[PDB]
Design an enzyme around this catalytic site. Structure first.
Site, mmCIF file in Angstrom:
data_model
loop_
_atom_site.group_PDB
_atom_site.id
_atom_site.type_symbol
_atom_site.label_atom_id
_atom_site.label_comp_id
_atom_site.label_asym_id
_atom_site.label_seq_id
_atom_site.Cartn_x
_atom_site.Cartn_y
_atom_site.Cartn_z
ATOM 1 C CG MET A 102 -14.350 42.307 4.046
ATOM 2 S SD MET A 102 -15.992 42.499 3.712
ATOM 3 C CE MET A 102 -16.410 43.371 5.036
ATOM 4 N N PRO A 103 -11.056 43.575 1.180
ATOM 5 C CG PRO A 103 -8.841 43.518 0.244
ATOM 6 C CD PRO A 103 -9.783 43.305 1.849
ATOM 7 C CG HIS A 104 -17.145 42.085 -1.136
ATOM 8 N ND1 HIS A 104 -18.055 42.811 -1.845
ATOM 9 C CD2 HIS A 104 -17.593 40.745 -1.333
ATOM 10 C CE1 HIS A 104 -19.188 42.338 -2.006
ATOM 11 N NE2 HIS A 104 -18.937 40.833 -1.810
ATOM 12 C CB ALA A 105 -15.815 43.400 -6.512
ATOM 13 C CG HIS A 163 -22.679 40.615 -0.216
ATOM 14 N ND1 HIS A 163 -21.514 41.039 -0.132
ATOM 15 C CD2 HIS A 163 -23.566 41.542 0.151
ATOM 16 C CE1 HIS A 163 -21.497 42.617 0.199
ATOM 17 N NE2 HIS A 163 -22.860 42.730 0.689
#
Length: 147
Positions: free
Chosen positions: A65-68, A111
């Site tokens: 799950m690519p996230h920042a 988020h």
């Protein structure tokens, strides 16, 4: 939560293979970048962290799950969904990733809401199978509409 509320339009992709580990993050994020849900720095923060240590958010064998954080360059709140038929190997992970879901949020509470929505997919092995076997963007989109 309605999953579909987080998916703008261009957010869903099937790809034969990503060019490399960085292009896999880019294909998880480009559909959010294209509507300025994020700035370019947001993608690079995930890439740099992945190079420094490894992918933060691995949820099952083959699933990421690519996230920042919002402050890394998010501008709005949304998601992406990208499947790689042959996968790609992320550094320091145990095996290659085939399934990636992008996430961005303008605020930490947004988020949390977004995370709680996508947990209805990423923490359900029945959905993970159907995402992994998805023949097309249409089959991926059906699973979003099901949420």
């Amino acid at each position: 939560m309605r999953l579909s509320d987080y998916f703008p339009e261009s957010s869903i992709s099937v790809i034969h293979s990503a060019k490399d580990w960085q292009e896999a993050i880019d294909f998880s994020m480009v559909s959010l970048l294209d509507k300025n849900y994020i700035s370019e720095n947001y993608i690079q923060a995930i890439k740099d962290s992945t190079i420094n240590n490894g992918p933060y958010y691995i949820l099952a064998p083959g699933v990421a799950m690519p996230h920042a954080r919002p402050e890394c360059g998010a501008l709005k709140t949304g998601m992406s969904l990208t499947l790689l038929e042959q996968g790609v190997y992320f550094p320091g992970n145990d095996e290659p990733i085939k399934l990636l879901i992008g996430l961005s949020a303008a605020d930490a509470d947004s988020h949390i809401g977004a995370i709680q929505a996508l947990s209805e997919l990423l923490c359900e092995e029945e959905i993970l199978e159907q995402l992994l076997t998805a023949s097309s963007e249409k089959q991926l989109a059906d699973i979003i509409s099901r949420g």
